[PDB]
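Exam revision sheet. Question 4 asks you to relate a sequence to its structure. Input first:
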Amino acid sequence: GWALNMKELKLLQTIGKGEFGDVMLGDYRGNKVAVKCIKNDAQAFLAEASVMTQLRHSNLVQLLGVIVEEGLYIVTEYMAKGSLVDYLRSRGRSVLGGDCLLKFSLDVCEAMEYLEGNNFVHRDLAARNVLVSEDNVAKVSDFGLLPVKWTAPEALREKKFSTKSDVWSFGILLWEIYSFGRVPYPRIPLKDVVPRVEKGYKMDAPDGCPPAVYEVMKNCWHLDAAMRPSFLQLREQLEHIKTHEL
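Answer key, structure tokens:
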């Protein structure tokens, strides 16, 4: 049950590449699948496989299978609409209404809530790393083993990560969502980002952003990591917004 037959997998095309290795659109005996080709040692993740393969939730890319040492062929569900960043730029304001933005935010928040609950840190939360299914559901990944504009400032200095730094990246992600995928920190220069953020600078609300969504973003951006709200509390704040703001 986690091993698939390599004999039946077809690698069709490279569709992304992470540090781990490229990611491919594959064909597993009939269905479109996404495949993580690893070469450059994997042996780490594989030890934690059962526990990291224990991770299942509907907003986490589902694992289908795994080929090993021939250096892994990780097989997962295929997210037909790609990266949310790309989707937000493509679809843009014209296609994506207010219900769609809160649903993407809730989808990611629920996945974050879940990983938070299992004591798992994401470390690279950003609209680029969120995928959209053919059914319009945003999901994040569970495979696992510094981008200045997304990373909490204590995680840039300290080089260590926690759920609380994922909370900082989630606000940055909300800002991406509400701005239809604009690169973060449009008012300042890349070089100045860290030094302004460290003194409390916060991005202004995306154009047309709902006041209450802007407060959630702001709460994610506390400089005291411990004082950022949990994904459990974020989930309640976003559910609250959905219930009254519509």
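Marking note for examiners. The chain is about 35% helix and 15% strand.
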